[PDB]
Amino acid sequence: HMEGLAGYVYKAASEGKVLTLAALLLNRSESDIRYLLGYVSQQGGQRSTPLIIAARNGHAKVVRLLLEHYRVQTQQTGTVRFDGYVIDGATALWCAAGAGHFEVVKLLVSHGANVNHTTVTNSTPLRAACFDGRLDIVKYLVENNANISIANKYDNTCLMIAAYKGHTDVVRYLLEQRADPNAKAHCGATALHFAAEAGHIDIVKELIKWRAAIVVNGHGMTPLKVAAESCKADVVELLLSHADCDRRSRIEALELLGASFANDRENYDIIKTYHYLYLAMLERFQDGILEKEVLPPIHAYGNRTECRNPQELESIRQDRDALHMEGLIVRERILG
Ligand SMILES: CC(C)(C)N1C(=O)c2ccc(C(=O)O)cc2C1=O
Incomplete structure (x- = not known):
């Protein structure tokens, strides 16, 4: 029963506890590790992946470990809760832009994340930052070719x-x-x-x-x-x-x-x-x-x-x- 074991991975990623997470994915083969890190989990009213939730919660350390050692794709799509509302089509990038997790955003583009990805409503991660108003992110996204003409x-x-x-x-x-x-x-x-x-x-x-x-x-x-x-x-x-x-x-x-x-x-x-x-x-x-x-x-x-x-x-x-x-x-x- 590997179902709940991927949940412990999801918790540890959301919790920011990098060591709890690091230790979970150790003596695991590549068959296993790829499943646990791409598993879509329902947190009540929020479906995400260990990468997504960690970037959504500003956990830089956890976001670093998944990309470098474990090489998890940033294409990954999810549906996250923000403002009370539910959004679908969100990359780990998009959650990080809307939440204003400055270092985490840099982490994801630095490791090759689509800056003009479109949510289901066609909201670029740049749009998210322009809602939240984090000039640091906006200047950074534009400096990495995020197109401002993309609209919702x-x-x-x-x-x-x-x-x-x-x-x-x-x-x-x-x-x-x-x-x-x-x-x-x-x-x-x-x-x-x-x-x-x-x-x-x-x-x-x-x-x-x-x-x-x-x-x-x-x-x-x-x-x-x-x-x-x-x-x-x-x-x-x-x-x-x-x-x-x-x-x-x-x-x-x-x-x-x-x-x-x-x-x-x-x-x-x-x-x-x-x-x-x-x-x-x-x-x-x-x-x-x-x-x-x-x-x-x-x-x-x-x-x-x-x-x-x-x-x-x-x-x-x-x-x-x-x-x-x-x-x-x-x-x-x-x-x-
Ligand atoms: C309606 C649009 C599409 C502009 N949109 C987001 O994409 C979005 C992302 C995050 C937040 C937040 O306040 O955290 C708010 C919004 C928001 O209004």
Whole structure:
């Protein structure tokens, strides 16, 4: 019964106990040793191999011994648990990149591991490191020909996932490494959209610095409207100090931004509501004008109607409750 004996090998590899592992695979023939080291074991909800689990747990010593003396392939595929989620198609490399085991990653590429291996979802180990934000790994993977153009199943680039996760220092690195800033996911989204909605004011600036294009995401919105809808005012001012539409895109962002100050405790502030929405109306009433196409009074948000004139809006810096309903009403004109 060699079944459970390969488990003791799996435990010792995961446990990092190199001597316990070293001693298990000694007076064993090559028939045996190849089986025990390539055995796929189920740890509750995790199927891996002694190499994979040891690299997944940052056990450098154990990862060294398997590659040098015992010459175990790095092609080996497994399914590991991370973040609570389950990933399939992971090499010992990929687990080590996502976990941020710097020395272990170097160990595997040093001993010939595919740096552009694709998980089932087509996530390069480089993508993993760009989620975790280990610049050391990212600089190292790129320096070993890991291709930054490889994207996940949904055309989500390492640049995007980084601009999402706030990893400013790596977004600068990928851009310096000539990562295409105008990538588009199936969502029709760009690294800008991800950063705009997320409020990563620094990353937005870098994308700006790298002549990133203003795309309207595949489902209706520019990164200006996305940041306004996500109520990230910092990003909206920075983005508005560049181009847009004449007054359409610009008054939309302001109206929308003030309107998002009516929804959820993201900064649920009506003082910043009146501020941005009154600004927006001013930019409409200069000469003559930018007409307001106001939706009909409906049973839901009270039978109110959007303010058309600045005079109608000037009458509500007081009366808090009416301002709240205005946010809902306008958010319905610009979105629906
Ligand atoms: C969704 C994508 C594909 C970007 N993806 C990983 O491949 C991945 C690997 C490791 C972690 C972690 O946080 O440890 C998170 C992710 C993660 O979001």
